[PDB]
Each structure stands twice: as structure tokens, then as C-alpha cells.
Design a protein around this ligand. Structure first.
Ligand SMILES: Nc1nc(=O)c2ncn([C@@H]3O[C@@H]4COP(=O)(O)O[C@H]5[C@@H](O)[C@H](n6cnc7c(N)ncnc76)O[C@@H]5COP(=O)(O)O[C@@H]3[C@@H]4O)c2[nH]1
Ligand SMILES: [Zn+2]
Length: 352
């Protein structure tokens, strides 16, 4: 616990470092937003509220920034791609230029999006900005040869969430049934991430995204509406997620020689954390004075997800983030062994 608190104190020393870097991400995003609005296909574009800086810049890792551009779309009709539950074809009930039959081409939309951004990068003489894995819905920029920012186009749909979500967002015993109903009345988003079609991609498919809901449940995270609003109600939920993310970042650095861990992501840690919040719904199970135990709760559940090769998407229960289709068996066994060693030995990766 004292070691975990020291880690948390150490992480705070880079508070201003991440602050100023988020401002550089922020300013470039606003110039991008204006140019995109000039285009007929993207003039309803805007910034989605997903991050801790302003409202639109999310930190996924040190110097890895995440921004989502939402696009209000006329009423959409969805067609689930096969039985994948997260991936969908988009149909209608301006964007005409991206249709292939009746299906809105994710690859064609994302292609023009990528093109317009690339045009604004070449034009700007303010700073050094460049372009850049596979299968991502994001277009990632590099600012000042040091700051990385994923920019993701996101179709906004204001209709009821798709059926694959009906048993997801299992917050009823933690944040309440009332809140679940309120959250499910908000829009959902589709990003041009394509399902894998054999060896390539179904380049017309989109994936559901609930990044806005993820931010809301992290910031408004207690059973008590006044959780973390006073000294009597200080929980350690956010600190536990921070320590889980830092554990994964540190292991990925230590195992960088053979890149065994590069498929694992802060998104996996965040998803597992939300499941532990469901499992431990009472604020009394996250008392700040129990940080060590709460972190152990998070590590042991993550370990179980690795061993069983099952980490359910928090909104889409039948989408398994740890399926063999996405992460090979050998990599999940590898990470299990190292987290087991770390937990058995009081986390030597956090030493010094
Ligand atoms: N900025 C950004 N927003 C996204 O929505 C997203 N989805 C994928 N990626 C990246 O594309 C590549 C393919 O990963 P895959 O989709 O097969 O599994 C992904 C995806 O299923 C899931 N995931 C990540 N971000 C989200 C997200 N915002 N919403 C839902 N699922 C997500 O966690 C897995 C690993 O994510 P990352 O390894 O950190 O970056 C991935 C990866 O580089 C994303 N990058
Ligand atoms: Zn709290």
C-alpha cells in the first residue's frame, strides 16, 4: 500500500508535462475541425467529449492522446456483420458519395477523412506534424516528433442501442437501474474499425463505440452521488485504474526486447476495471485506506481474464477482447505468468 501510494505520487510529478502536451493536441484538433467542416461530407463534424483535458483529449498512455470526431448522421439502419455483435454494416432509412449499393463504405469515408487531415498537415508551417498499426479506425498524428494523437471518425446515431448491447452495461447494482436507463438513451457511435474477413478486412463494416459512456462512468463512479465530493467519501477507484494501467505499461517496457506484450492495451485494463466495479458495487469496497486490497482485487480479476482467455467488452458481452482471434494463446499465457509473479512478490516492477 505504501509502495502503491509512492507510485501514485511519482505519477503526479508529470502532471504539468501531460498538461502542456494536451494543449498542443488541443490546438491542432481545432484547426482540423474547421477544415473538415468546409467539406460537404463533414460539416456536421464536431468533437466528442471523451477525455480529461478540456473535454476532447483523452490520455491512453504517456504521450499517447486520443480524440474522437463525431458526425451527426441521418437516421441509420444497422445490419450486424455475420454474428460478431460488435461490427455492423451501415445503411440509410450528402454522404451519398461513400455508398456502395446501399451500404455506407467505412473504408471510403475513412479514406477522405484521412485525406483532408493530410492536406491540413502539409499546409501548416506552425509545427512539425506527420502521419502514420493495422485495422485501426484512427488516423494518428505525431506532434513535435514526441506527441502521438489518434484521431477517430465516429458516426453518431441517436436511436436505441443495438440488440448486442441489451445485456451489457451491467451497472444496475452499482450505479443503479435509473442511471443505466439514462445512459442507454444517449447516442452510440460507430467507428470505421473493420471486422476481420479471413485474411483481410470487411472494409465496409463499422464497430460500436461507447467512449462517451466510458468517460461518464469513470468520472461519476460511486454508488453515492457524492462519492469523492467530500473528505468522508474518498474512494480509490480511479487510483486503482491508474495503477493497473501503469502496471501494464511497465511490463510492456520491460518485455520490449521480444515484444511479447504488444497486443495488450490500456483498453483491456479499463474494461477489466469496469467489471470489477460491477463485482464490487459498494463504495465501502473502495475505501482509500484499502488501496492495497482494492488493487489486488483488480489484479486478480485481470489474471482470471487472462487465464480463461475471456475479457468481455463492457457494453457488448458476447464480444470477447481476449479471444484467440484477437490475441494469441501464447501471449495471454505469457502475461499471466508475469502478473502472477508480480502479484506473488509485492510488485517488484514498482520498486525504487
Ligand atoms: N484510438 C482508437 N479508438 C478505437 O476505438 C480503436 N479500436 C481499435 N483501435 C486500435 O486498432 C488496432 C486493432 O485493435 P482491435 O480493434 O482488433 O482490438 C481493440 C479494440 O477491440 C478495443 N478497443 C480499443 N479502443 C476501443 C474503444 N474506444 N471502444 C471499443 N473498443 C476499443 O481494444 C483492442 C485493442 O486496442 P489498441 O491496441 O489499444 O489499438 C487498437 C489496435 O491498434 C482503436 N484505437
Ligand atoms: Zn469516488
Amino acid at each position: 500500500a505504501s509502495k502503491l501510494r509512492a507510485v501514485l505520487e511519482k505519477l503526479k510529478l508529470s502532471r504539468d508535462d501531460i498538461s502542456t502536451a494536451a494543449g498542443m493536441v488541443k490546438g491542432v484538433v481545432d484547426h482540423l475541425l474547421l477544415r473538415l467542416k468546409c467539406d460537404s461530407a463533414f460539416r456536421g463534424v464536431g468533437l466528442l467529449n471523451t477525455g480529461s483535458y478540456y473535454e476532447h483529449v483523452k490520455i491512453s498512455a504517456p504521450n499517447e492522446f486520443d480524440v474522437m470526431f463525431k458526425l451527426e448522421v441521418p437516421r441509420i439502419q444497422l445490419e450486424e456483420y455475420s454474428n460478431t455483435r460488435a461490427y455492423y454494416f451501415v445503411k440509410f432509412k450528402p454522404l451519398s458519395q461513400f455508398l456502395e449499393g446501399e451500404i455506407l463504405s467505412a473504408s471510403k469515408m475513412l479514406s477522405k477523412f484521412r485525406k483532408i487531415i493530410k492536406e491540413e498537415i502539409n499546409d501548416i508551417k506552425d509545427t512539425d506534424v506527420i502521419m502514420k498499426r493495422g485495422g485501426s479506425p484512427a488516423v494518428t498524428l505525431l506532434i513535435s516528433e514526441k506527441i502521438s494523437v489518434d484521431i477517430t471518425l465516429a458516426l453518431e446515431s441517436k436511436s436505441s442501442w443495438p440488440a448486442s448491447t441489451q445485456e451489457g452495461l451491467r451497472i444496475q447494482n452499482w450505479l443503479s437501474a435509473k442511471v443505466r436507463k439514462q445512459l442507454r438513451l444517449k447516442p452510440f457511435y460507430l467507428v470505421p474499425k473493420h471486422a476481420k474477413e479471413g485474411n483481410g478486412f470487411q472494409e465496409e463494416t463499422w464497430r460500436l463505440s461507447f467512449s462517451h459512456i466510458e468517460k461518464e462512468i469513470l468520472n461519476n463512479h460511486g454508488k453515492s452521488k457524492t462519492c469523492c465530493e467530500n473528505k468522508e467519501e474518498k474512494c480509490c477507484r480511479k487510483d486503482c485504474l491508474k495503477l493497473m494501467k501503469y502496471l501494464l505499461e511497465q511490463l510492456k517496457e520491460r518485455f520490449k526486447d521480444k515484444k511479447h506484450l504488444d497486443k495488450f492495451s490500456s483498453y483491456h485494463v479499463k474494461t477489466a476495471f469496469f467489471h470489477v466495479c460491477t463485482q464490487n458495487p459498494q463504495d465501502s469496497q473502495w475505501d482509500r485506506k484499502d488501496l492495497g486490497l482494492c488493487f489486488d482485487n483488480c489484479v486478480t480479476y485481470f489474471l482470471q481474464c487472462l487465464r480463461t482467455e475471456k475479457l468481455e467488452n463492457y457494453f457488448i458481452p458476447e464480444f470477447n477482447l481476449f479471444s484467440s482471434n484477437l490475441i494469441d494463446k501464447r501471449s495471454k499465457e505469457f502475461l499471466t505468468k508475469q502478473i502472477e509473479y508480480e502479484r506473488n512478490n509485492e510488485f517488484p516492477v514498482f520498486d525504487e
